[PDB]
């Protein structure tokens, strides 16, 4: 035989991994399930081919390094990585992970979630996020499609290609993503002093979506998204407005007609009132007032699962070997080659 091919995509992962089956794809990778002939179990394998562009190499290095370092129950791990023995031959990287049964996106398209499952899924998202933030890292791209699930109701966050080390006084500009509907307003307004609070907003959007099986702030353009946000939260108060840098967004916001706040129980008449209370606090326009991940976990909505003694944090802040932003793609390729060497046959530490 030869290399198995999934949907015209060659997956050169044999002979260890065989019997490939398509399970999904994003804007950057194609994911298959495969049989691990060493561990006698089926696994997930994402193929990416990033080396022609700096930003794609960033995604690959960021995801690999962060996931190899992180250890948490609600964060997908990386078990293995496949690539060519020499750097010149390396065109593709294959990331091997635990096979999760589905993701929240697919689930929400096929069924409704019970009020209890919504609560528990939210709990696990926030539990994983607490660990991420404690490592001084921003995920920056939380969405239903990268919350992986098993039917046992275990949830794991994946897809860390856009993740950065927190730094307010310092990665989205023009980078293609499949969906922008989970992004905080300050990102759309380009306020540019982003904090952990952008992740909390995404979680808010995800909670509202679990509650209704609809995105709360869709739109083709940021203009439309922002208008959807204001159409529900109402015009920002003066106090929020002058909490903003720049001026161009401020004045656009000031140029806009007044819009009243729409009561959450009008949007979601049948949602648990405690869920709506937490939703209001996550979907706060002013990022400085938006609830923080540790406070979110302690909110009455999550009381059945809240247990600070079993909500672990990272031992230390995460750091790349150096800031990645200005590294040429050629250099990033070397760094990816080196980070992946440990999974090569015959490798010694």
């Amino acid at each position: 035989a030869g290399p198995e091919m999934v949907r015209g995509q060659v997956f050169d992962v044999g002979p260890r991994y065989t019997n490939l089956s398509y399970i999904g794809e994003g804007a950057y990778g194609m994911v298959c399930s495969a049989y691990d002939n060493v561990n006698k179990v089926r696994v997930a394998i994402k193929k990416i081919s990033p080396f022609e562009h700096q930003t794609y190499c960033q995604r690959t290095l960021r995801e690999i390094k962060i996931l190899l370092r992180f250890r948490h129950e609600n964060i997908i791990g990386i078990n293995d990585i496949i690539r060519a023995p020499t750097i010149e031959q390396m065109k593709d990287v294959y990331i091997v992970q635990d096979l999760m049964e589905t993701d929240l996106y697919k689930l929400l398209k096929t069924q409704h979630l019970s009020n209890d499952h919504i609560c528990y899924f939210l709990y696990q998202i926030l539990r994983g996020l607490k660990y991420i933030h404690s490592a001084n890292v921003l995920h920056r791209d939380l969405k239903p499609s990268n919350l992986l699930l098993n039917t046992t109701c275990d949830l794991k966050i994946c897809d860390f290609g856009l993740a950065r080390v927190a730094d307010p006084d310092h990665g989205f500009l023009t980078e293609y993503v499949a969906t922008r509907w989970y992004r905080a307003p300050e990102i759309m307004l380009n306020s540019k002093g982003y904090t952990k609070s952008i992740d909390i907003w995404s979680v808010g959007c995800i909670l509202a979506e679990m509650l209704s099986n609809r995105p709360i702030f869709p739109g083709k353009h940021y203009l439309d998204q922002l208008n959807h946000i204001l159409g529900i939260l109402g015009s920002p108060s003066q106090e929020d407005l002058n909490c903003i840098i720049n001026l161009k967004a401020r004045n656009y916001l000031l140029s806009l007609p007044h819009k009243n706040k729409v009561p959450w129980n009008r949007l979601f008449p049948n949602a648990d009132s405690k869920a709506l209370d937490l939703l209001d606090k996550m979907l706060t326009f002013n990022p400085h007032k938006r609830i923080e991940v540790e406070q979110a976990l302690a909110h009455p909505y999550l009381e059945q699962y809240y247990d600070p003694s079993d909500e672990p944090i990272a031992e230390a802040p995460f750091k790349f070997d150096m800031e990645l932003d200005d590294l040429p793609k050629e250099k990033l390729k070397e760094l990816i080659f080196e980070e992946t060497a440990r999974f090569q046959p015959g490798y010694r530490s």
């Binding site: 696990q124 109701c153 699962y305 247990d307």
Partner: protein, 313 residues
């Protein structure tokens, strides 16, 4: 239910959260098709924009009006009076490689047009290719049902064509989808030539055995019509139906193939066929087998989760 200016008549089609009825526009007494779509279950935005922009093409179904009552959207389109393509050509009195070439040429040009505009159809079954009337003129053919079609766009929505950037898997997916369109034209070509479908013997075939045939990319090219079918036709189908999309022709490359370009030097001999209802049955079974997937398991109780267990003590 949407306008007192039309008389709604019989159902002429049913789709996913949709149904199509023939209707008569009272003021002009002109006939139309109206496709009702449940917007609460199926967002028709993409289909509408694609029909708006590209429906002016002669061989794409034309969108003449849109109604929206809040829950349902209603697409007023031209009425396909001539029935499905195969229902015509497998029943008609004279059919040869010449007519089949004219057919692939008209549909091919239209698919090339869509792909060049960044549109993939993705549901290009023969049953979604209709005649607008009974003339049998290849020019009267229309590609219909863009319910699954997709327009390539940039990161901020900007209309994009594959010619003159988008994320890399998005581009591979567009290529894969273009290949699937071509592969469906290959199925159509095979069926026109052979008088039966390449991967199914009939409606009683199991999804399992159809898929293994498809996966192996094996199909008969001998016996029956094939004995007298031109070699250039055989070459073309083998390339359209090819196992890996890499060695599979683009729409442009189909239109450049000698079987299509040299339609003058093509045999005019009569082509046989299996019984129409059998062919349609095998066709549907083939697409059913292609687009089916094992239903996904139901969620378990929260208490199936080890973490959740730790919390209930």
């Amino acid at each position: 239910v949407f306008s007192d200016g039309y008389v709604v008549k019989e159902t002429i089609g049913v789709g996913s959260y949709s149904e199509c009825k023939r209707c008569v526009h009272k003021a002009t007494n002109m006939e139309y098709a109206v496709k009702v779509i449940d917007k609460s279950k199926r967002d028709p935005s993409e289909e509408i924009e694609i029909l708006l922009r590209y429906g002016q093409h002669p061989n794409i179904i034309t969108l003449k009006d849109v109604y929206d009552d809040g829950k349902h959207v209603y697409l007023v389109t031209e009425l396909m009076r001539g029935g499905e393509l195969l229902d015509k050509i497998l029943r008609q009195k004279f059919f040869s490689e010449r007519e089949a070439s004219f057919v692939l040429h008209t549909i091919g040009k239209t698919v090339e047009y869509l792909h060049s505009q960044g549109v993939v159809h993705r549901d290009l079954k023969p049953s979604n290719i209709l005649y607008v009337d009974e003339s049998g003129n290849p020019e009267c053919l229309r590609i219909c049902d863009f319910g699954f079609a997709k327009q390539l766009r940039a990161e901020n929505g900007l209309l994009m064509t594959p010619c003159y950037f988008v994320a890399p898997e998005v581009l591979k997916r567009q290529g894969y989808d273009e290949g699937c369109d071509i592969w469906s034209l290959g199925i159509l070509l095979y069926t026109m030539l052979a008088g039966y479908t390449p991967f199914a013997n009939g409606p009683s075939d199991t999804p399992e055995e159809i898929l293994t045939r498809i996966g192996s990319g094996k199909f008969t090219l001998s016996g029956g019509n094939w004995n007298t079918v031109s070699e250039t036709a055989k070459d073309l189908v083998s390339k359209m139906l090819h196992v890996d999309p890499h060695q599979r022709l683009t729409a442009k490359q189909v239109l450049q193939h000698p079987w299509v370009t040299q339609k003058d030097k093509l045999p005019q001999s009569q082509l046989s066929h299996q019984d129409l209802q059998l062919v349609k049955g095998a066709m549907a079974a083939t697409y059913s087998a292609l687009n089916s997937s094992k239903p996904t398991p139901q969620l378990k109780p929260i208490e199936s989760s080890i973490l959740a267990q730790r919390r209930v003590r």
